[PDB]
Design a binder for this molecule. Sequence first.
Ligand code: CL
Ligand code: NA
Length: 268
Amino acid sequence: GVVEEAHNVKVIGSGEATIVLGHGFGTDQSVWKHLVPHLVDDYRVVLYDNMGAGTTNPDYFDFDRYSNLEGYSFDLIAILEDLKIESCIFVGHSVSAMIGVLASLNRPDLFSKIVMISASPRYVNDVDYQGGFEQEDLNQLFEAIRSNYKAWCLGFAPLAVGGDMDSIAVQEFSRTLFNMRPDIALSVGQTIFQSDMRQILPFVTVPCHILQSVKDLAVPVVVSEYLHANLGCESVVEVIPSDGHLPQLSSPDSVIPVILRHIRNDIA
Ligand SMILES: [Cl-]
Ligand code: NA
């Protein structure tokens, strides 16, 4: 099937409920490697790659469809409908948290809960808003991608991953970052970094679990509180004593149990 092939959809596990795992920018479904073994005995698990990931065909990257995050939300809904999944627990890493939120606004019937990892509705600082970046910071990041994509990946991956600069996770993310076609990485990086999901948070009706590393290059802790305060749904926050934007990959021993607690248990 076109949908399953385009997004490298993999369906594994067995159980009454279905968990769908959505990855962030610069990585792919392999980011879930340490989580999947803890899910397969109890749940059906769906893994897929975002269009534009290095593992996807650059010829299918539709610039108009992906000019807003809603294009990725429609792909996620297309995957659920293709597999006849009527309800899932959705775990969204980084940009996928907002993709999940937008998909739940279009189709709240398809989601019983959203577990967010490293989420942000806005990265740029605003009047009464700390996002973590000034426009100048992003401008330098985009110029580095234009100037030398290979050197930008090598320098960015250790900062995004956090921890020891020579870890397996740093090596894995450097590799998936550099597998992206340079012009798509720039295009997508700009669309994400320039997004603003703040206005729609009060209309969310699916319960949200907001998880993040206490030290995350792109997500100040205050963003977790901003999401909790503005999401119109029931929500819970858990700030994890970890370093890194992909903590499920880089510190699984301390992070995986937190993610499992929010997948396995519901907000009272
Ligand atoms: Cl629902
Ligand atoms: Na809330």
